Amino acid sequence: GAFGDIQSRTVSSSDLYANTNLVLQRPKAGAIHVPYTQAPSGFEQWKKD
Amino acid sequence: STEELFNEYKLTRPYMARCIRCAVGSCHSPIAIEAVKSDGHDGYVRLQTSSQY
């Protein structure tokens, strides 16, 4: 949730650092989907502030 | 003209996915939107749907 949550050494670098606090959740009974939890894009927050 | 217009479409085929609400409840419809980007400054939207056209 902070500026620089997703970092990449260079533009073309395939390896990257990610800290989004991704947490998987329990899916709904009878529904096929991938539930998840993540922090809002810190890039957008910084762009706003 | 060119593979960009020939398109991998011939290989792909549209598919279906779950929507939260299809009117009266959820359903497995091809209209389902996978992701939406809103980075353009002019107000245009780029939606990615589960179907192809």
Side-chain angles (χ1 to χ4, degrees):
Chain A
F3 181 74
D5 51 0
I6 305 301
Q7 302 178 6
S8 180
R9 185 67 183 90
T10 64
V11 174
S12 66
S13 178
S14 63
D15 288 350
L16 60 89
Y17 174 80
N19 192 346
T20 64
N21 196 27
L22 181 65
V23 179
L24 298 177
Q25 304 295 354
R26 184 177 183 275
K28 286 289 184 178
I32 298 175
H33 60 80
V34 179
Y36 63 94
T37 295
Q38 64 179 76
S41 177
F43 179 79
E44 290 300 310
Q45 183 64 46
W46 182 86
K47 181 177 180 181
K48 297 180 182 179
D49 297 314
Chain B
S1 176
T2 305
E3 291 177 357
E4 291 176 356
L5 295 178
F6 289 164
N7 195 341
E8 66 275 8
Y9 167 89
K10 292 181 180 181
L11 180 59
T12 57
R13 187 184 67 171
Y15 65 90
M16 295 178 285
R18 181 180 291 274
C19 275
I20 296 169
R21 294 293 182 272
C22 296
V24 186
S26 66
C27 76
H28 296 286
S29 170
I31 197 171
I33 301 170
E34 190 65 49
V36 179
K37 305 295 182 185
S38 55
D39 297 310
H41 293 96
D42 60 359
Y44 296 169
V45 296
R46 189 181 73 194
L47 274 57
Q48 181 178 3
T49 62
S50 71
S51 67
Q52 294 181 284
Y53 68 97

